[PDB]
Amino acid sequence: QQKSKLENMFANMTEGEVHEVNIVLKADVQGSVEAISDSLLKLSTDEVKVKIIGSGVGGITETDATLAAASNAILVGFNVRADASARKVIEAESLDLRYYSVIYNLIDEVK
Amino acid sequence: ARYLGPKLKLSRREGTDLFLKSGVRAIDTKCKIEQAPGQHGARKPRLSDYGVQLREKQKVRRIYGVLERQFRNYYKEAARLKGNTGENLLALLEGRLDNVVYRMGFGATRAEARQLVSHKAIMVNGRVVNIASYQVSPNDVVSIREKAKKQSRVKAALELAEQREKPTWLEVDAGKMEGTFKRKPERSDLSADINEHLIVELYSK
Amino acid sequence: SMQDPIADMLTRIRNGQAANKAAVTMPSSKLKVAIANVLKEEGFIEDFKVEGDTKPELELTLKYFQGKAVVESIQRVSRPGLRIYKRKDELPKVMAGLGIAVVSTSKGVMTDRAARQAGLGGEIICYVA
Amino acid sequence: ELQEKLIAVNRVSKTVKGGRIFSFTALTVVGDGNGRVGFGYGKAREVPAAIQKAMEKARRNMINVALNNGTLQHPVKGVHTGSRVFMQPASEGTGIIAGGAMRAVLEVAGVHNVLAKAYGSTNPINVVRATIDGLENMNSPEMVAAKRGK
Amino acid sequence: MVTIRLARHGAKKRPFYQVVVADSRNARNGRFIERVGFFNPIASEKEEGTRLDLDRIAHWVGQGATISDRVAALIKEVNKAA
Amino acid sequence: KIRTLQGRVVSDKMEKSIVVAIERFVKHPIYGKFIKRTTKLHVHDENNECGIGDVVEIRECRPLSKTKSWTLVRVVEKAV
Amino acid sequence: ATVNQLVRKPRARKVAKSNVPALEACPQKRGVCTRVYTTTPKKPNSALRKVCRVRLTNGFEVTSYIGGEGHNLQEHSVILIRGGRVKDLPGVRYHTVRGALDCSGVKDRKQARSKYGVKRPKA
RNA sequence: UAGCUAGUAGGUGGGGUAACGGCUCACCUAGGCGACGAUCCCUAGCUGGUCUGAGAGGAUGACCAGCCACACUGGAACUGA
RNA sequence: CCCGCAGAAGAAGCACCGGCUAACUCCGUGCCAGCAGCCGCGGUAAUACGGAGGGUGCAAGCGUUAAUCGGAAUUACUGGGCGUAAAGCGCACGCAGGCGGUUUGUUAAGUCAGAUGUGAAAUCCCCGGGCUCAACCUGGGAACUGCAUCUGAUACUGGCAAG
Ligand SMILES: [Mg+2]
Ligand SMILES: [Mg+2]
Ligand SMILES: [Mg+2]
Ligand SMILES: [Mg+2]
Ligand SMILES: [Mg+2]
Ligand SMILES: [Mg+2]
Ligand SMILES: [Mg+2]
Ligand SMILES: [Mg+2]
Ligand SMILES: [Mg+2]
Ligand SMILES: [Mg+2]
Ligand SMILES: [Mg+2]
Ligand SMILES: [Mg+2]
Ligand SMILES: [Mg+2]
Ligand SMILES: [Mg+2]
Ligand SMILES: [Mg+2]
């Protein structure tokens, strides 16, 4: 964490690529979150930078919806269902809940 | 539940002999009493009015080797008893088992008295007692068991035990290697240099 | 005003003792006389007296031993605005027993010491130091 | 039998035409062990000069205080300036438990038992004299036999 | 149904039963009418340990109380005069 | 006779019914001041008896309405 | 003063509001800590101090001082916030816990290991 | 939050409950509660006690134990002491 | 739980040291980096920061934070004020409410005495007993300051009567 931040050796980016998109991901299976993220970092480009925040072990939760509340992001899951306490937060504030059966339909839309 | 560090550093800090250096030879000679308690202990002995109350608390505790939580229970027990609270404080400390082992002269030092009691060598009224904090009452006989009897550790203590004060409140015996606690010690028989009015004040606030 | 005439007497004492006046006059009553009798019983005041017929007038002769006053202090304990009643051992002793209080019991007006021996208490009036 | 000590030392500024000069004011209380309580304040430009003048004034103006054995004879109240002082006898029990400024005057007097608890102003200069006025107005059960008894 | 029965208020690995008159529908340590005695099944060979007042229980037996297997044993252990 | 309090009539006609406001003296737990407490209680009665400007004796009974668990026995004097 | 007045209106007591608006009977909390600024101190002192705006789990936006020399704290990775008030920046009622959850401890520190979450070095 | 209450307050008669009762009906009367805080709003199980305190008080209702209420939400009755 | 075997072997950390508050120097840094519960420390001699040495407190705990009370007589019944520091309505007449001169009789509400019933047990407290001691457990007593009824006392207050 310290290296990546200090690596730039400057207080900001040298050019205008500073604009980025944030995503929030929780997949039911542990095998996917590490595997597909690597493929999710392949679609990354210099112009627009995408990064994963708070990869989950499964489902959805209060602190996860809160995580997407602070910074604007899409909340996606390989396979997930909404909790009773989860629906209340998502329905109240403006957010987006989208679950995808396959990784291909996901890799296309993030792009 | 014990100090384990240097015993003479506790004696040097207070500026009075706590009788942890009793052993074989006694009355110091080699001392450096006060003068350098630490590195900068040669600094002037002027000390606060609050600190001298805390200093006397340590003076009493470091002799018998009692911790503040264990000592708070004896102060709490001394308060609920009748008469003077200060006199009953030292009486309950003097009622400890390891202290009675030190007075009769089985252990050479007070730390060695707890050391010997810990190994279950001491028996009271027939029955064995591990715990050094065991409360000794009047008409309670105490003696060393058949195992570990007449050893060079206990034998050397009983020889030099005659050279000290020899307390009136208990019988020394040392012939058959036993002892008897007759009655509770008087105010004149203990204390003198250590004060009861100083130590008690600190727990009021 | 004249609502509490017993507390007036307790004011007349300390004004008399401070000013060094011997004789102090005031209007008398039933309870007014009985409290003054308790002061002489223990021996704070010198002697009490009354003179009149249609208008009774209590005359209290104040005692002086040294330049300092005999009675140290006196305060209105049970007042019309707030009354104080004590059972038997709840009666408060004044200055570790030294001196006496004034207490009105069913049999009569007695001291704090004497009321304990009787086995019954009542309305405490004032603490005579 | 002298039994002398100091409570606290305080620095005080004058601030003359030239500049600020700092004096030192001590407070001491003395007693013989049974009654005879006395105190002295004073001032001086140095610390050891101030305490010497305090003990010099502490000898004179010494007055008898009535004690039964080693305690007060009753619970007594006293007031001085803005310091209101209550106290309890508590006969031969635990004893001499109190905070600094008022600790000195009680212990040197001879009492080993009475409870302090100083209300109102807790100033070291005014907490002393509140005590001695409280001790002076107190009277002995033996010598009140003029008013007591007959 | 009022019942004379032993409730355990003592300690872990060191039982101390309290014989007491209580309704069967209430709990062991719960509600009761009033205490009668005590029974320690640890104790030692000494003057005290087992105590039970026969004047108290024999009243409740007349009023229609039942006796448990323990209380039946403890009455016939201590007996009456013995 | 069963225990009785010294309350007064206060209200006149409730159509074969009567209330009793009961004055007492009670010590206040904290301060120790005496305040007069007024305990109004409904009471059952027969044959439209005398009303306000009276002090009435009272005793406990079974409730013949909602609340109203008391009954009267004797009344002192006539006029207020 | 008069006791008859006190019977009508008894003696009032102040609510005594706490110095930790989070409340919930909680000794510690956690929060998102979105942005970490460097604000100057009050009048008497002069420095550059590390401070973070912590969005708590209950849903209150608050600010908190970062103790210790240097940090990795920024953006994401939720951290522990113990609280307590020390006065330097204008309006800072809390403190962050170093060496807890995802918050790094102070590097190369030897004294005061209890504070700042520094582990004992093997010797 | 200063006015709040139509079964609301009381009586008579009938029905009803294991049992007294506007418990529930018909009829009659116009009362009832309230500045000693009614009603309304906010908050909360209560007590033996625990914690603090010299005491008076303050705060608190974990475990232990009594009583009441609740048994996914709302409502109702049966069986049965 | 008792006995035997081996061998000091397997077992001490934590805060703090400017004053308050028990316990001090050097070095590094130089209003930088940081400490802080409060007043405050650091801009080249820092016992206040960081490290080291030394020391103090406490101990299988230690410290920080959070919560309650005490300290706080700073809601003050016990137990505080209101000229100038926060605080006497601008002033007056007045209902409810609070309080009431003095003499006698009566009532016994308040108050006070005695007795009965009740105030569960546990807990707290006191003297004992049992787990190797203590915590813990437990016998008995005291206490639970309260409330009600009955039988008495009549000083004071209240009701009532005559003054
Ligand atoms: Mg321990
Ligand atoms: Mg009917
Ligand atoms: Mg609730
Ligand atoms: Mg207090
Ligand atoms: Mg249901
Ligand atoms: Mg049925
Ligand atoms: Mg110091
Ligand atoms: Mg530090
Ligand atoms: Mg330097
Ligand atoms: Mg207070
Ligand atoms: Mg004030
Ligand atoms: Mg003014
Ligand atoms: Mg009980
Ligand atoms: Mg024992
Ligand atoms: Mg009268």
PDB file of C-alpha atoms in Angstrom, chain F residues 7-62:
ATOM      1  CA  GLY F   7     -62.907  13.321  54.197  1.00  0.00           C
ATOM      2  CA  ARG F   8     -65.583  15.861  53.182  1.00  0.00           C
ATOM      3  CA  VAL F   9     -68.396  15.893  50.583  1.00  0.00           C
ATOM      4  CA  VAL F  10     -67.148  18.528  48.025  1.00  0.00           C
ATOM      5  CA  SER F  11     -69.678  17.557  45.224  1.00  0.00           C
ATOM      6  CA  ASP F  12     -73.483  17.532  45.723  1.00  0.00           C
ATOM      7  CA  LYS F  13     -75.639  15.472  43.303  1.00  0.00           C
ATOM      8  CA  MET F  14     -74.485  12.592  41.048  1.00  0.00           C
ATOM      9  CA  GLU F  15     -77.976  10.913  41.124  1.00  0.00           C
ATOM     10  CA  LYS F  16     -77.710   8.408  44.028  1.00  0.00           C
ATOM     11  CA  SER F  17     -73.900   8.729  44.253  1.00  0.00           C
ATOM     12  CA  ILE F  18     -71.409  10.752  46.328  1.00  0.00           C
ATOM     13  CA  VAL F  19     -67.652  11.580  46.266  1.00  0.00           C
ATOM     14  CA  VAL F  20     -65.367  12.066  49.320  1.00  0.00           C
ATOM     15  CA  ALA F  21     -62.300  14.353  49.079  1.00  0.00           C
ATOM     16  CA  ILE F  22     -59.939  13.271  51.899  1.00  0.00           C
ATOM     17  CA  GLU F  23     -57.504  15.815  53.400  1.00  0.00           C
ATOM     18  CA  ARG F  24     -54.437  14.480  55.274  1.00  0.00           C
ATOM     19  CA  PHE F  25     -50.951  15.539  56.447  1.00  0.00           C
ATOM     20  CA  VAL F  26     -48.000  13.588  54.949  1.00  0.00           C
ATOM     21  CA  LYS F  27     -44.204  14.009  55.239  1.00  0.00           C
ATOM     22  CA  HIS F  28     -42.422  14.661  51.921  1.00  0.00           C
ATOM     23  CA  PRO F  29     -39.628  11.972  51.607  1.00  0.00           C
ATOM     24  CA  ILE F  30     -36.707  14.260  50.565  1.00  0.00           C
ATOM     25  CA  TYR F  31     -37.308  17.792  51.930  1.00  0.00           C
ATOM     26  CA  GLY F  32     -39.556  16.943  54.923  1.00  0.00           C
ATOM     27  CA  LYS F  33     -42.227  19.596  54.180  1.00  0.00           C
ATOM     28  CA  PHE F  34     -45.886  18.854  55.041  1.00  0.00           C
ATOM     29  CA  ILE F  35     -48.265  19.240  52.067  1.00  0.00           C
ATOM     30  CA  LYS F  36     -52.030  18.619  52.287  1.00  0.00           C
ATOM     31  CA  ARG F  37     -52.925  15.727  49.926  1.00  0.00           C
ATOM     32  CA  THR F  38     -56.483  15.434  48.499  1.00  0.00           C
ATOM     33  CA  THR F  39     -57.708  11.871  47.763  1.00  0.00           C
ATOM     34  CA  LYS F  40     -61.078  12.005  45.929  1.00  0.00           C
ATOM     35  CA  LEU F  41     -62.947   8.664  46.182  1.00  0.00           C
ATOM     36  CA  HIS F  42     -66.382   7.636  44.851  1.00  0.00           C
ATOM     37  CA  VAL F  43     -68.810   6.346  47.528  1.00  0.00           C
ATOM     38  CA  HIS F  44     -72.153   4.479  47.406  1.00  0.00           C
ATOM     39  CA  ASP F  45     -75.201   5.829  49.278  1.00  0.00           C
ATOM     40  CA  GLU F  46     -78.961   5.336  49.806  1.00  0.00           C
ATOM     41  CA  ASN F  47     -82.119   7.544  49.746  1.00  0.00           C
ATOM     42  CA  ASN F  48     -80.635  10.876  48.432  1.00  0.00           C
ATOM     43  CA  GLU F  49     -78.986  11.975  51.736  1.00  0.00           C
ATOM     44  CA  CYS F  50     -77.456  15.372  52.731  1.00  0.00           C
ATOM     45  CA  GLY F  51     -74.866  16.890  50.357  1.00  0.00           C
ATOM     46  CA  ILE F  52     -72.170  19.620  50.341  1.00  0.00           C
ATOM     47  CA  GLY F  53     -71.130  21.574  53.443  1.00  0.00           C
ATOM     48  CA  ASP F  54     -70.611  18.376  55.494  1.00  0.00           C
ATOM     49  CA  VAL F  55     -67.895  15.968  56.716  1.00  0.00           C
ATOM     50  CA  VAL F  56     -68.805  12.277  56.212  1.00  0.00           C
ATOM     51  CA  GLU F  57     -67.512   8.994  57.721  1.00  0.00           C
ATOM     52  CA  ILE F  58     -66.499   6.251  55.242  1.00  0.00           C
ATOM     53  CA  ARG F  59     -65.842   2.452  55.106  1.00  0.00           C
ATOM     54  CA  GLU F  60     -64.717  -0.246  52.624  1.00  0.00           C
ATOM     55  CA  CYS F  61     -67.130  -2.478  50.647  1.00  0.00           C
ATOM     56  CA  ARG F  62     -67.628  -4.394  47.355  1.00  0.00           C
TER      57      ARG F  62
END
